[PDB]
Design an enzyme around this catalytic site. Sequence first.
Site, PDB file in Angstrom:
ATOM      1  CB  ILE A  21      -0.931   0.036   1.218  1.00 44.14           C
ATOM      2  CG1 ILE A  21      -2.192  -0.768   0.971  1.00 44.14           C
ATOM      3  CG2 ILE A  21      -1.301   1.471   1.552  1.00 44.14           C
ATOM      4  CD1 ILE A  21      -3.182  -0.581   2.086  1.00 44.14           C
ATOM      5  N   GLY A  22       1.704   1.370   1.025  1.00 44.87           N
ATOM      6  CA  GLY A  22       2.557   2.525   1.164  1.00 44.87           C
ATOM      7  C   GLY A  22       3.639   2.323   2.197  1.00 44.87           C
ATOM      8  CD  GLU A  23       7.951   2.115   3.195  1.00 40.93           C
ATOM      9  OE1 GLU A  23       7.907   2.217   4.442  1.00 40.93           O
ATOM     10  OE2 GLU A  23       8.497   1.167   2.596  1.00 40.93           O
ATOM     11  N   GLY A  24       5.264   3.567   6.158  1.00 41.31           N
ATOM     12  CA  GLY A  24       5.223   4.269   7.418  1.00 41.31           C
ATOM     13  C   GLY A  24       6.574   4.901   7.731  1.00 41.31           C
ATOM     14  CB  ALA A  25       7.679   6.710  10.764  1.00 45.91           C
ATOM     15  CE1 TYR A  26       7.800   3.369  14.821  1.00 48.20           C
ATOM     16  CE2 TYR A  26       8.328   5.553  13.994  1.00 48.20           C
ATOM     17  CZ  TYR A  26       7.643   4.739  14.870  1.00 48.20           C
ATOM     18  OH  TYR A  26       6.795   5.297  15.803  1.00 48.20           O
ATOM     19  CG  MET A  28       6.142  -2.193   3.593  1.00 49.90           C
ATOM     20  SD  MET A  28       7.201  -3.504   2.963  1.00 49.90           S
ATOM     21  CE  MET A  28       6.345  -3.949   1.448  1.00 49.90           C
ATOM     22  CB  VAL A  29       1.449   0.324   5.216  1.00 49.32           C
ATOM     23  CG1 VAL A  29      -0.028   0.198   4.986  1.00 49.32           C
ATOM     24  CG2 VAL A  29       1.706   0.819   6.628  1.00 49.32           C
ATOM     25  CG  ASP A 139       1.266  13.964  14.424  1.00 51.56           C
ATOM     26  OD1 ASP A 139       1.663  15.074  13.999  1.00 51.56           O
ATOM     27  OD2 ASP A 139       1.545  12.884  13.851  1.00 51.56           O
TER      28      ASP A 139
HETATM   29  N1  LIG Z   1      -5.906   1.435   7.590  1.00 51.59           N
HETATM   30  C1  LIG Z   1      -5.225   1.998   6.437  1.00 51.59           C
HETATM   31  N2  LIG Z   1      -5.817   1.934   5.240  1.00 51.59           N
HETATM   32  C2  LIG Z   1      -5.228   2.444   4.159  1.00 51.59           C
HETATM   33  N3  LIG Z   1      -4.040   3.023   4.233  1.00 51.59           N
HETATM   34  C3  LIG Z   1      -3.355   3.138   5.409  1.00 51.59           C
HETATM   35  C4  LIG Z   1      -3.935   2.626   6.561  1.00 51.59           C
HETATM   36  C5  LIG Z   1      -3.007   2.883   7.627  1.00 51.59           C
HETATM   37  I1  LIG Z   1      -3.119   2.422   9.707  1.00 51.59           I
HETATM   38  C6  LIG Z   1      -1.923   3.545   7.064  1.00 51.59           C
HETATM   39  N4  LIG Z   1      -2.132   3.695   5.754  1.00 51.59           N
HETATM   40  C7  LIG Z   1      -1.155   4.335   4.891  1.00 51.59           C
HETATM   41  O1  LIG Z   1      -0.412   5.503   5.785  1.00 51.59           O
HETATM   42  C8  LIG Z   1      -0.944   6.645   5.447  1.00 51.59           C
HETATM   43  C9  LIG Z   1      -1.453   7.490   6.663  1.00 51.59           C
HETATM   44  O2  LIG Z   1      -0.358   7.730   7.507  1.00 51.59           O
HETATM   45  C10 LIG Z   1      -2.141   6.268   4.491  1.00 51.59           C
HETATM   46  O3  LIG Z   1      -2.385   7.193   3.540  1.00 51.59           O
HETATM   47  C11 LIG Z   1      -1.624   4.974   3.861  1.00 51.59           C
HETATM   48  O4  LIG Z   1      -0.510   5.278   2.869  1.00 51.59           O
END
Ligand SMILES: Nc1ncnc2c1c(I)cn2[C@@H]1O[C@H](CO)[C@@H](O)[C@H]1O
Length: 350
Positions: A21-26, A28-29, A139
């Site tokens: 899906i994407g990235e977090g700080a520390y 993955m997602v 935040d």
């Molecule tokens: N429950 C979720 N459904 C879809 N995306 C999620 C989440 C979560 I927790 C995090 N993210 C991804 O992190 C971004 C928000 O910080 C979001 O924009 C995304 O990149």
Amino acid sequence: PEMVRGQVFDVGPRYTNLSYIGEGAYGMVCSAYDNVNKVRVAIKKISPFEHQTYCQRTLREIKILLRFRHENIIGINDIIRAPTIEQMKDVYIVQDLMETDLYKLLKTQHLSNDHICYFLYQILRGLKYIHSANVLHRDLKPSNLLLNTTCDLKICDFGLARVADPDHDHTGFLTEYVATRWYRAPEIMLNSKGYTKSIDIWSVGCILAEMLSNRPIFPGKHYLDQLNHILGILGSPSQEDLNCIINLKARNYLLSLPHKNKVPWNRLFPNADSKALDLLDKMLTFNPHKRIEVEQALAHPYLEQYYDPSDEPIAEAPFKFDMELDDLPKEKLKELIFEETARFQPGYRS
Ligand SMILES: Nc1ncnc2c1c(I)cn2[C@@H]1O[C@H](CO)[C@@H](O)[C@H]1O
Ligand code: NA
């Protein structure tokens, strides 16, 4: 088993059909398919154990989300880690899959007055529950507002939250990271007063302004530049507002400022509902003591179509930190984490 490009996900066999899906700080997602609940979910892979600051944020989020239940706040469905504390260096938080977030959406869409209205209502409704638990998010910003539809908003990322302590003011300017800069109330930057509910109302104010124009209302490069942006719109503060400036060093970069007039809101946002703009004004007050509180915000005429105190839950019990964890060895926090995630491990007794 499990993989997904590069870093591999120790989820499964429950969770499969992964898809980055994407990235977090520390961490993955990904999105996975939950083979129990038979729906797609989101899994945050978290490895914080290297800096102690990351273990604070991770532990705070788990303790708080694990005790909150509210439809405008993300929950934790499943936490899965290794069996042995020694063998644990990743942690997977399973949460409901959301389609997007207010940040991603504001990059692609101007919002009608109406949609903004019920987005703000859902923000404040969730905020009402947080504050009633004696808790501060700290935040709040668009990318921490997850969205499924115009009627499904959930506050997420409680990594910076604190129990409210108007008295725990510490005056450690560089001692804490409080709010992303653009959404940071002035008393944070002036006093280091990051332990009052007022700071969350400021943040929401900034979010309301961003919805009205698709751009952040105070986009400073650094903390002093953030103040110039605030004053450039609010105007030079009053004497009384310079009295709650405890940082006796702070009154100066102010006083050595060229008086600025208050920019009328309808001039900044000429297409916005005058009621929106009235609430904005109550939320973006320079002085924390004169800023509107969450229940007052909900009662504002701008939200009168949705306000419903009987359909707006509050926490059953104020929240409590069993031991404050500012200065704790990062392996103690990893201990405390292994502990708190025991709920989701086989055999967990009690
Ligand atoms: N429950 C979720 N459904 C879809 N995306 C999620 C989440 C979560 I927790 C995090 N993210 C991804 O992190 C971004 C928000 O910080 C979001 O924009 C995304 O990149
Ligand atoms: Na998050």
